[PDB]
């Protein structure tokens, strides 16, 4: 009900292009037509000027930042022969990460995750890759990308991306996503550590708020990462001829990295559950200590109140005369029984 | 820095740099404290075994790596002490990164030291960070000629090193099992707030131990399935057996993690019983003294027109009804297990 739900298309036909997302303020088209010895880059805005790179045998990376403009994305899909369902999944942010092996192009959907300190909100950004054996169309919804290492790798002839074809380009983009996932797991690990210190050192009422919000963020993170295992397994198993066999070990590497992030998320879920259980145990220990002190006050003093009440009576001809001059013939009993009871409690591990 | 070569650990004490040149019938030990006088072992037909124990000195590491043909980034991976277990096959050497664990039992810490293996079909280098290491079985096998290691090439030497690490992991699992048993007997008998942090530390150590073990399954599956040409064909079943030990170790650590997870719940139940004990104490005290304070407080009513004084031992009789109702409540509590 806060636009994070999927009341997006309802009964509209699959060919519709209603932009589910909300970031509809900025738009541009990065182009990098690198080759074995050539490298062309620009920051265009006009849709037409990027088309002549479709038929070029030299690999090209076209990064369309901002897909709220339905016209540009539909024109790109029409000129590239992209299936209308793929366009629908392009403009639908609330779509699971996925892979589609078509006759002409490979379609891949990832989610870039970013995190903010203090308040625990994990904001998502749909990112899409379409590999067309000579061009890698990348769709993103606002500037702020984790591809900067990749952009430098093309810009300066370092690594292998400057030499290989578009398949390695897509592999490098996937690896950039996975590295972003590493850094976000590191940040959430720092959050786990601070929450663990808070729980173990200073339990508080707001700690439940913190741990439940963190568990919600973690379960959403798992909801998104778990499809990545299947996505990379599909990118490795039953390879189409559209991806070269020489880059398959790179997809093995990123698949292993995805396995690592899945294991780390499962471990972090386990640690969060353990932290909640530790807080419950601390609550139980506080209850036990408070009841211990209450009972010990209620066992070495309440009998004393009784004995004071019973010895002082509105009776006569009682064998409790002032034969001891002073009154305290009973205070000694109070002290003795109090000492005996407190020693009994001390040897019973209470207090 | 881009592709630099620096040491990112913390154990910086000293180095030894020893070597064992073992063969079919003769062997030699030439441990020194100099980078030179050991490089000539590269081209020797008899397999050799170099131990750069202590890689704080980047000079020796770089000289040995670049002289033996090790690529500089392999040297960086050696010097990086934060990497998970890794395997990388090159055209003339195989690189492996393993982690060996030590356990401070007195204060319950689990420290990790990385060991780097390089097989070159003519020598087996290891780079370590701390003096002393878990290689006594293989070292005694080579020195005393006890095993069959002599006549099986450097591949069996690398297997022997892997087996030494796996046996050390089994020993670490035994120590962790002992610690778990000590905690389990400590809990349910001595409940305490400290036991929660003890359990949490054990769980974190198990998390780290699993995070190190799980890459080893992949590394060993790589080692036998992919059958690199550096490793002879006849040695593959040995690495298969080591992988079986690795999957056994992974199962063991998974079961230990599950047991530690249930340990907190059993502690919570123990604490609930512990507070139930003092609750029964409070209830019995109240229910034998609160209902027993009227006839010690209802007598005390500053009023006349009662037999407050005309009685046959009135105060002894009220003490008698004290005892009667006291034992009545005691029976009421004992006969149906209110304690």
């Amino acid at each position, epitope marked *: 009900m806060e636009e994070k739900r999927l009341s997006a298309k309802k009964g509209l036909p699959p060919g519709t292009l209603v932009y589910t997302g909300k970031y509809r303020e900025d738009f541009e088209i990065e182009v990098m037509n690198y080759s074995i*010895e050539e490298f062309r880059e620009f920051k265009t805005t006009d849709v037409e000027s990027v088309l002549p790179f479709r038929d070029s045998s030299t690999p090209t990376w076209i990064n369309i930042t901002g897909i709220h403009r339905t016209d540009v994305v539909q024109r790109v899909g029409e000129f590239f022969g992209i299936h209308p369902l793929v366009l629908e999944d392009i403009l639908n942010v609330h779509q699971r990460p996925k892979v589609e092996f078509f006759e002409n192009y490979v379609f891949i959907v990832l989610k870039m995750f970013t995190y903010d300190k203090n308040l625990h909100e994990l904001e998502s950004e749909q990112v899409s890759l379409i590999l067309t054996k000579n061009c890698v169309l990348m769709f993103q919804e606002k500037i702020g990308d984790v591809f900067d290492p990749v952009r430098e790798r093309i810009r300066y002839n370092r690594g292998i991306i400057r030499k290989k074809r578009a398949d390695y380009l897509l592999y490098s983009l996937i690896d950039a996503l996975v590295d972003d996932y590493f850094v976000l797991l590191e940040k959430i690990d720092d959050e786990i550590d601070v929450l663990e210190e808070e729980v173990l050192e200073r339990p508080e009422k707001e700690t439940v708020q913190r741990t439940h919000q963190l568990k919600r963020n973690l379960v959403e993170l798992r909801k998104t990462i778990w499809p990545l295992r299947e996505v990379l397994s599909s990118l490795y198993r039953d390879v189409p001829p559209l991806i070269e066999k020489e880059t398959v070990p790179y997809f093995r590497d990123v698949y292993d990295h995805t396995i690592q992030i899945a294991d780390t998320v499962e471990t972090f879920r386990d640690i969060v559950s353990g932290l909640l259980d530790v807080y419950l145990s601390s609550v139980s220990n506080k209850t036990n200590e408070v009841m211990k002190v209450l009972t010990i006050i209620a066992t070495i003093f309440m009998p004393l109140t009784f004995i004071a009440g019973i010895y002082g009576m509105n009776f006569e001809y009682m064998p409790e005369l002032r034969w001891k001059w002073g009154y305290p013939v009973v205070l000694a009993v109070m002290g003795v029984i109090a000492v005996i009871m407190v020693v009994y409690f001390k040897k019973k591990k209470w207090l | 820095p*881009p592709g*630099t070569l620096v040491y990112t650990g913390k154990y910086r004490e000293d180095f030894e740099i020893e070597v064992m040149n073992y063969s079919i019938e003769e062997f030699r030990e030439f441990k020194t404290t100099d980078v030179e006088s050991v490089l000539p072992f590269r081209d020797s037909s008899t397999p050799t075994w170099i131990n750069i124990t202590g890689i704080h000195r*980047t000079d020796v590491v770089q000289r040995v790596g670049e002289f033996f*043909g090790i*690529h500089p*980034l392999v040297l960086e991976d050696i010097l990086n002490v934060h990497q998970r277990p890794k395997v990388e096959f*090159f055209e003339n050497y195989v690189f492996i990164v393993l982690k060996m664990f030590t356990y401070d039992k007195n204060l319950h810490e689990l420290e990790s030291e990385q060991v780097s293996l390089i097989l070159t079909k003519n020598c087996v280098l290891m780079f370590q960070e701390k003096i002393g290491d878990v290689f006594d079985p293989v070292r005694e096998r080579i020195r005393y000629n006890r095993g069959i290691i002599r006549k099986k090439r450097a591949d069996y030497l690398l297997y022997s090193l892997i087996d030494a690490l796996v046996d050390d992991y089994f020993v670490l699992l035994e120590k962790i099992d002992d610690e778990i048993d000590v905690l389990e007997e400590e809990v349910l008998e001595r409940p305490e707030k400290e036991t929660v942090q003890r359990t949490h530390q054990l769980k974190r150590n198990l998390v780290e131990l699993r995070k190190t073990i799980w890459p080893l399954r992949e590394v060993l599956s790589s080692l036998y399935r992919d059958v690199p040409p550096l490793i002879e064909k006849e040695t593959v079943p040995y690495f298969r057996d080591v992988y079986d030990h690795t999957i056994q170790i992974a199962d063991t650590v998974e079961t230990f993690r599950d047991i530690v997870s249930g340990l907190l719940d059993v502690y919570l139940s123990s604490v609930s019983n512990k507070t139930n004990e003092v609750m029964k104490v409070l209830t019995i005290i109240a229910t034998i003294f609160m209902p027993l304070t009227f006839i010690a407080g209802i007598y005390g009513m500053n009023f006349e027109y009662m037999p407050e004084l005309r009685w046959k031992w009135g105060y002894p009789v009220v003490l008698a009804v004290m005892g009667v109702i006291a034992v009545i409540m005691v029976v009421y509590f004992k006969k149906k297990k209110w304690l």
Partner: antibody, heavy 127, light 108 residues
Framework: VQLVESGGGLVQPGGSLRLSCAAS????????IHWVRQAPGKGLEWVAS????????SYADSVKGRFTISADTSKNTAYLQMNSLRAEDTAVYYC???????????????????????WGQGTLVTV | SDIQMTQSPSSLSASVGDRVTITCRAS??????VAWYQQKPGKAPKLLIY???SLYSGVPSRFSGSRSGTDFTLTISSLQPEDFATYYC?????????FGQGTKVEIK
């Protein structure tokens, strides 16, 4: 991307010399340098290597322990202190900047061992 | 512990528009760490080929290199009179580093 040398001329045998190759366009600190020699009308042979990040120096076995070499990050210049001069040291010296392209992560990682893109102009030293 | 790293021919005669081949071999396998350098008498060498397969940027696509295990081959498809110099065969798998004895080709 420019390596420029200085300090050529004639020296008495057994004397001393300083050979400076200034580098422009890159940082020496996290980089490597090499000095090689070309005897007059002969082949080309390696002499010395600097890995300036760790202050690492390597000398050719034919000149082992007799030369000195280091770097200076402040001026970004590689320096070679030539000592214990021999009659065969007269040559043309060349300062080169090593390099290598790499990609890490693959099961069979594709690394390249160093080579020499950029070369100094040269310096003639005679004994 | 030196590595003998030989390069042949010592000298050769080739005309313009010829496919010349320079062979090189090390005593021990050096993987693919061999590089081919070109030095004119008045110039300050230059890196033609690194790792025996990759072609350096700026070099014309004419030059090529191959791999035969221990053997390394540098092939020039069609020589130009301007590109006549001495070609060296460096190895870098082992730190000491050695260069080829030399291969000078002049105009035929």
């Amino acid at each position: 991307v420019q390596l420029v040398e200085s300090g050529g001329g004639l020296v008495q045998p057994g004397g001393s010399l300083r050979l400076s190759c200034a580098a422009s366009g890159f940082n020496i600190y996290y980089s490597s340098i090499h000095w090689v020699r070309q005897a007059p009308g002969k082949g080309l042979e390696w002499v010395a290597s600097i890995y300036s990040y760790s202050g690492y120096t390597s000398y050719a076995d034919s000149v082992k322990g007799r030369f000195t070499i280091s770097a200076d990050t402040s001026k970004n210049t590689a320096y070679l202190q030539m000592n214990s001069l021999r009659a065969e040291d007269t040559a043309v010296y060349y300062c080169a900047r090593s390099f290598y392209v790499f990609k890490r992560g693959t099961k069979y990682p594709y690394y390249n061992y160093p080579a020499m893109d950029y070369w100094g102009q040269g310096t003639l030293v005679t004994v | 512990s030196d590595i003998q790293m030989t390069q042949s021919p010592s000298s050769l005669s080739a005309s313009v528009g010829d496919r010349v081949t320079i062979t090189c071999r090390a005593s021990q396998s050096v993987s693919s760490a061999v590089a081919w350098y070109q030095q004119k008498p008045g110039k300050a060498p230059k890196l033609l080929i690194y790792s025996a397969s990759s072609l350096y940027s700026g070099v014309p696509s004419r030059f090529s290199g191959s791999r035969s295990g221990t053997d390394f081959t540098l092939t020039i498809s069609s020589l130009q009179p301007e590109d006549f110099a001495t070609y060296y065969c460096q190895q870098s798998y082992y730190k000491p580093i050695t260069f080829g004895q030399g291969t000078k080709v002049e105009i035929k």
